[PDB]
C-alpha cells in the first residue's frame, strides 16, 4: 500500500543491482526454508532447480507451489500473482530420488 496496490520500499532499499527484486520463502520437505530473490518475472523453475540442484534432489521428484499452487517452469511470481516475501512449499512430484 503506497497509493493503491504498490509497496513503497524501492525508494529506500536497492543497493544490489536494479533497486530490489522480490524474495520468495521456499519451504522444503526437510523443513529447510530458503529465501530467494528472483525478479518479478523470473522462471520459477530456476527457483525450483536452485533448491533441488544444490541440495541434491532430482527435479522430477519435487514440486514447488505457491500456497498449494503448482509452479510451472515458465511461471513467475508476477504471473501467479505473488509479490516480494511470498511463500512457496515443496512437495513430492514423483518417487524419491
Amino acid at each position: 500500500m503506497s497509493d493503491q496496490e504498490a509497496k513503497p520500499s524501492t525508494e529506500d532499499l536497492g543497493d544490489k543491482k536494479e533497486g530490489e527484486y522480490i524474495k520468495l520463502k521456499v519451504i522444503g520437505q526437510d523443513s529447510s526454508e530458503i529465501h530467494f530473490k528472483v525478479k518479478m518475472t523470473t522462471h520459477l523453475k530456476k527457483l525450483k532447480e536452485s533448491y533441488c540442484q544444490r541440495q541434491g534432489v532430482p527435479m522430477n521428484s519435487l514440486r514447488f507451489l505457491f500456497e498449494g499452487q503448482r509452479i510451472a517452469d515458465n511461471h513467475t511470481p508476477k504471473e501467479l500473482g505473488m509479490e516480494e516475501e511470498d511463500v512457496i512449499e515443496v512437495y513430492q512430484e514423483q518417487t524419491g530420488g
Binding site: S31, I34, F36, V38, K39, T42, H43, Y51
Partner: peptide, 20 residues
C-alpha cells in the same frame, strides 16, 4: 551493553541471478 550470540544455522540454499 548488548552482546551478540552465535546462532545455529540449517540448510542454506543460494539464489540464482535475476531475470527481466
Amino acid at each position: 551493553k548488548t552482546s551478540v550470540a552465535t546462532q545455529c544455522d540449517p540448510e542454506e540454499i543460494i539464489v540464482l541471478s535475476d531475470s527481466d
